[PDB]
């Protein structure tokens, strides 16, 4: 991909800056500097970089569209790379903390950060907070003289909050919400009355769509000075449609994609997660199959988990996902066509992001 070599060079630059700033400001010693370097490398690298490279693709598209000269283009691509690394380090923070919350075993084909024997959940919580803090440090340093710094911080921090509210919906989805009460232990549901299409949409739009689709598009517009050239409502809507679909794919792959190909071991079934598969099953399956689901879901027993995967297979959940995907293609294409009539350059950058999403396999 066109910007990978530039994006990787900016990673080395931003790492040297952040570790050097810690030596200057916090009397950082050689041993902890080395620990933080390995933490940054382990938590920030190894993913697909769809969020970071989107910022650069958008910023280049809009820089060409507005005919920026060689010096201005070089600045926009460098700024775009730094904003990309803000989102990648936000992702790194989110996955560190989520791997602790889900008690997960593998991430990007390596042990979860907290499961490194030299780490533990106790230290990893704080390592994940350093990652989050470092994302803002990059804006405050690299964009100190840029009029777009204010808007970069606003959209970044808004999406940061959004994602934690989605995570609140996610971690409370398997308990009766009327019984959500800090003073009283919460039994996992046995009736699954709240496993609804509305509740699934609300989890995935807030926990995933905002930081995965909306934030990279907006940051690429902000760094190129072109946010006012596009339809904000139309941009938001296509980000929500693609983001929901992206997390639906992630939900389908939890069950049906081998962990060795995905690079992680999902436990949506053993954790009774309100996944797209769980909701689509519960709302479409015959009564006797719903009963077998309730008797087996949310159990660590490998046979129980196999019963659930057999129920999903027998209810044609992969076929049902394919019909959902067809409806999403129709809607994304219509929204892109509407963007394209207003600003073709930005519409092309949404098509790039959509082509890396549609029918992905990991």
Ligand X SMILES: CCCCc1ccc[n+](CC(P(=O)(O)O)P(=O)(O)O)c1
- Where do contacts with Ca ion occur on this chain (CB under 5 A)? 98, 102, 250, 254, 266
208 binds ligand IPR (CB under 6 A): yes
Q: How far from 183 is each of 176, 186, 188, 315, CA to CA, in Å?
A: 15, 9, 16, 39
Q: Which stretch binds ligand IPR (CB under 6 A): 18-26, 46-54, 304-312, 339-347?
A: 46-54
User: Considering the rule CB under 6 A, would residue 108 count as an interface residue with ligand IPR?
Assistant: yes
Min. distance of Cβ 246 from ligand IPR in angstroms?
A: 7
> Least Å distance between CB 204 and ligand IPR?
9
β-partners of residue 106 are 111
How far apart CA 230 and CA 299 sit, in angstroms, is: 48
- In degrees and rounded to multiples of 5, residue 185 shows phi and psi of -55, 140
Q: Could you say which of Ca ion, a second copy, ligand X, none residue 15 binds, taking C-beta under 5 to 8 angstroms by partner kind?
A: none
Contacts of 336 (CB under 8 A, 6+ apart): 238, 347, 350, 351, 354
Say if residue 79 carries a ligand binding annotation.
no
Distance (Å, rounded) from C-alpha 275 to C-alpha 145? 44
Angstrom CA distances, 309 to 264, 270, 281, 357, 362, stand at 18, 11, 11, 24, 19
Half-sphere exposure of 359 (CA within 13 A, CB side): 5
Handedness of CA 134, 135, 141, 142 (dihedral sign): positive
Candidate list 220, 225, 266, 298; residue touching ligand X; CB under 6 A: 266
- Among 79, 102, 160, 244, contact with ligand X (rule: CB under 6 A): 102
Binding range to ligand X, per CB under 6 A, among 7-15, 67-75, 94-102, 194-202? 94-102
Question: Any known ligand binding at 41?
Answer: no
Q: Does 208 bind ligand X (CB under 6 A)?
A: yes
Minimum Å distance from CB 225 to a second copy?
18
What is the contact surface with a second copy in residues (CB under 8 A)? 22, 25-29, 31-32, 34-36, 38-39, 42, 97, 100-103, 113, 116-119, 121-123, 125-127, 129-130, 132-134, 136-137, 140, 149-150, 153-154, 157-158, 160-162, 164-169, 171-172, 177-178, 180-186, 202, 206
Q: Which residues of 44-75 are buried (b: 16+ CB within 10 A; e: fewer)?
A: beebebbbbbbbbbbbbbbbebeebeeeebee
Nearer to ligand X (CB atom), residue 151 or residue 194: 194
First to last CA, the chain: 17
Residues found near ligand X in the complex (CB under 6 A): 94, 97-98, 102, 126, 163-164, 167, 170, 207-208, 250, 264, 266
Contact set with ligand IPR (CB under 6 A): 47-48, 50, 91, 108, 208, 212, 247, 250
């Amino acid at each position: 991909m066109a910007h990978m070599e530039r994006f990787q060079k900016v990673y080395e630059e931003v790492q040297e800056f952040l570790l050097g700033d810690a030596e200057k400001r916090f009397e950082m010693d050689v041993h902890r500097k080395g620990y933080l370097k390995s933490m940054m490398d382990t938590t920030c690298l190894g993913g697909k970089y769809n969020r970071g490279l989107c910022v650069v693709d958008v910023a280049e598209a809009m820089a060409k569209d507005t005919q920026m000269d060689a010096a201005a283009m070089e600045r926009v691509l460098h700024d775009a790379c730094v904003c990309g690394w803000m989102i990648e380090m936000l992702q790194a923070h989110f996955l560190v903390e989520d791997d602790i919350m889900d008690h997960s075993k593998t991430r990007r084909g390596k042990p979860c950060w907290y499961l490194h024997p030299g780490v533990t959940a106790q230290v990893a919580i704080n390592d994940g907070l350093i990652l989050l803090a470092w994302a803002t440090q990059m804006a405050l340093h690299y964009f100190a003289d840029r009029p777009f710094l204010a808007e970069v911080l606003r959209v970044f921090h808004d999406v940061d909050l959004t994602t934690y509210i989605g995570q609140l919906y996610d971690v409370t989805s398997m308990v009766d919400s009327a019984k959500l009460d800090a003073k009283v232990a919460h039994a996992n549901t046995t009736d699954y009355v709240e496993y609804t299409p509305f509740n699934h949409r609300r989890i995935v739009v807030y926990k995933t769509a905002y930081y995965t689709y909306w934030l990279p598009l907006v940051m690429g517009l902000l760094v190129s000075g072109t946010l006012e050239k596009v339809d904000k409502k139309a941009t938001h809507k296509v980000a929500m449609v693609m983001g929901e679909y992206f997390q639906v794919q992630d939900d389908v792959m939890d069950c049906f994609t081998p962990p060795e190909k995905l690079g992680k071991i999902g436990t949506d079934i053993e954790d009774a997660k309100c996944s797209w598969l769980a909701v689509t099953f519960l709302t479409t399956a015959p009564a006797e199959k719903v009963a077998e689901f309730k008797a087996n879901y949310g159990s660590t027993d490998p046979a129980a988990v196999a019963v659930i995967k057999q129920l999903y297979t027998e209810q044609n959940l992969l076929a049902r996902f394919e019909e959902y995907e067809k409806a999403v293609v129709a809607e994304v294409e219509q929204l892109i066509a509407a963007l394209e009539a207003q600003n073709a350059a930005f519409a092309a950058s949404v098509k790039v992001l959509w082509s890396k999403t549609y029918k992905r396999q990991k």
